[PDB]
């Protein structure tokens, strides 16, 4: 119990996916206009990542791990294709299920699922999982925490950009430049948890 609280708080604060590892910045910097759409996209990322990390853990440990199937046979060169295929298939199937059975959940957050079918956040999450050699429960907790941290960061940036309706930005920085500078200031702020070892 105390081993998973550490993982949760770590993945949420000490190791942010958005501001610390720089995963998924294009959507993080593009869909950050409104807090509502940012919250919807954050929930979508939480769901997709929480489903994608443990399934890929299962597939890896079952097939792709060294000597898993036959001794002396290492199929680790298939990690990239296997991970990206599982991610895309799960995202598409979830989109279809929600569009068919649950129209409210679709019009709420399933509208964002085509954006994250191939996103660096989830792929980097699975890669870090195979690097850190998590068990199944550790994969579940790590995926959930990483999704929650990404959502916290994108919703904070959306709140800042919606507070910045009163700003007067130079024409060259209006748009992308001031968003880059804002994300940089957000990272400078999030560097508070640097020395912590959780």
């Amino acid at each position: 119990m105390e081993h998973y609280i550490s993982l949760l708080v770590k993945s949420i604060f000490i190791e942010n996916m958005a501001l610390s590892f720089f995963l998924g910045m294009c959507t993080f910097l593009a869909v950050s206009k409104k807090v509502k759409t940012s919250f919807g996209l954050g929930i979508a990322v939480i769901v997709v990542l929480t489903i994608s990390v443990p399934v890929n853990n299962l597939v890896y440990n079952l097939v792709l791990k060294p000597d898993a199937l036959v001794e002396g046979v290492d199929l680790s060169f298939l990690n990239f294709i296997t991970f990206i295929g599982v991610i895309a298939a799960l995202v598409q199937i979830l989109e279809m299920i929600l569009d068919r059975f649950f129209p409210p959940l679709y019009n709420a957050l399933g509208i964002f699922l085509p954006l994250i079918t191939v996103n660096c956040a989830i792929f980097g999450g699975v890669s870090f999982m195979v690097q850190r050699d998590y068990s199944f429960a550790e994969s579940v907790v790590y995926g959930f925490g990483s999704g929650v941290g990404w959502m916290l960061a994108i919703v904070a940036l959306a709140g800042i950009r919606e507070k910045m309706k009163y700003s007067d930005v130079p024409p060259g920085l209006r748009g992308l430049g001031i968003t880059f500078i804002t994300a940089g200031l957000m990272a400078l702020g999030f560097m508070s948890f640097s020395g912590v070892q959780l």
Binding site: L69, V73, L75, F77, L78, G85, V86, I97, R100
Partner: protein, 408 residues
């Protein structure tokens, strides 16, 4: 070679399992039945379509051609329909072109609705009566140096029922026209020869659909009169191709064949006893003539009317005879023409300058209340901007300024 076999088989098996599970989830959990498009709740007319497609294309393939001019990319903004229950979302271009006042009643763009749900439409009765026509050309004689009159002939003893101020679209096949084949008289051939426009030519590959405003009041039966201008390459880049449909119509001569598709319109005379002011220019003589002749012949009104036409020189002045006849027969109508720069051959003794300044100096400055009149305006964009500026400066509300901008 023991690892390579496992690698190839595992790659193929994983990709195949993924593709197969995708196809299986698509087969069961995606509907493929039928969708009914009830174009109106009252009649039995409903269209059955597959979920793949667009609402506008579906209505077209059915045969109900809604009012549209450009034909793509939402640049027209006229393919408007009212839906009570259908595609439940609105696109950014739709927020750009319509306001929240059109949302609550149910108006929506027919171009960007996704047909995956059962829809309930309410279209205006005008869209139902738009026939596709065949026509023969009676005359294609010039009226100005760059304005050419096209008089079609509608067959089978019928007349297009349209209000004064409407328009009709024209279609054309792929073609290749030489500018030397144009029939231009020697009096207007002056600037033609001087700029050497006859070197141009136009080549098109696909059917094209442009619109033009009828130049006769509906009581003149059997004839469809238009006023087309030659859309030569702009003076900034003389190397670009010329206009397509304008060149096609200039190519048309006696006895040829061309099609027109249905009466449309959004520029009609308001119903009130207020003074009318018709500010025209360029090819706007067509809707202005439609309006004035309708008022003075079909409705027989006594509203104080006026007309102010602005041209470059006396060579470009046309339709003087019938307007003199109207002004002489009726004491309501009085029309004045203003030449930007008359030639020495013109022997002009009258108003000279820009039409907005002439109207403001001679009529609207001494006027009692310019804000109580109805202003009908159609011409070149510079004239439109200058006259709208003058009217807004004179304290005139946008509900009195009624404007038709050629391809706004």
């Amino acid at each position: 070679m023991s690892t390579i076999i496992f690698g190839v088989v595992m790659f193929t098996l994983i990709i195949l399992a993924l593709v197969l599970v995708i196809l299986f989830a698509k087969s069961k959990l995606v509907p493929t039945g039928d969708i009914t498009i009830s174009i109106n709740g009252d009649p039995e007319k409903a269209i059955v379509t597959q979920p793949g497609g667009k609402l506008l294309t579906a209505l077209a393939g059915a045969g109900v051609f809604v009012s549209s001019a450009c034909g793509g990319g939402g640049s027209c903004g006229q393919c408007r329909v009212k839906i009570k229950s259908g595609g439940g979302d609105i696109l950014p271009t739709e927020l750009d072109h319509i306001s929240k006042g059109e949302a609550r009643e149910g108006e929506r763009l027919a171009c960007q609705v996704a047909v995956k749900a059962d829809m309930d439409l309410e279209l205006p009765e005008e869209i139902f009566g738009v026939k596709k026509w065949e026509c023969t050309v009676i005359s294609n004689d010039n009226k100005a140096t760059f304005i050419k009159e096209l008089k079609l002939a509608i067959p089978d003893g019928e007349s297009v029922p349209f209000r004064a101020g409407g328009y009709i679209q024209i279609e054309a096949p792929a073609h290749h026209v030489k500018y030397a084949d144009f029939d231009v008289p020697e009096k207007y051939r002056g600037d033609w020869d001087k700029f050497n426009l006859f070197r141009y030519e136009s080549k098109v590959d696909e059917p094209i659909i442009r619109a033009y405003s009828m130049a006769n009041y509906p009581e003149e039966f059997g004839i469809i009169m238009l006023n087309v201008r030659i859309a030569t390459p702009p003076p900034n880049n003389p190397n670009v191709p010329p206009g397509q449909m304008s060149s096609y119509i200039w190519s048309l001569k006696a006895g040829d064949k061309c099609t027109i598709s249905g009466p449309f319109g959004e520029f009609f005379a308001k119903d009130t006893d207020a003074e009318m002011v018709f500010i025209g220019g360029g090819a706007g003589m067509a809707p202005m003539r439609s309006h004035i002749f309708d008022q003075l012949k079909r409705l027989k009104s006594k509203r104080k009317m006026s007309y102010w036409y602005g041209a470059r020189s006396k060579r470009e002045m046309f339709y003087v005879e019938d307007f003199d006849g109207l002004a002489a027969e009726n004491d309501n109508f009085v029309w004045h023409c203003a030449l930007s720069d008359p030639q020495p051959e013109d022997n002009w003794t009258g108003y000279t300058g820009f039409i907005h300044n002439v109207l403001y100096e001679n009529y609207l400055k001494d006027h009692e209340a310019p804000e109580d009149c109805e202003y009908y305006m159609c011409g070149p964009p510079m004239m439109n901007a200058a006259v709208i500026n003058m009217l807004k400066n004179l304290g005139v509300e946008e509900e009195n300024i009624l404007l038709d901008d050629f391809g706004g």
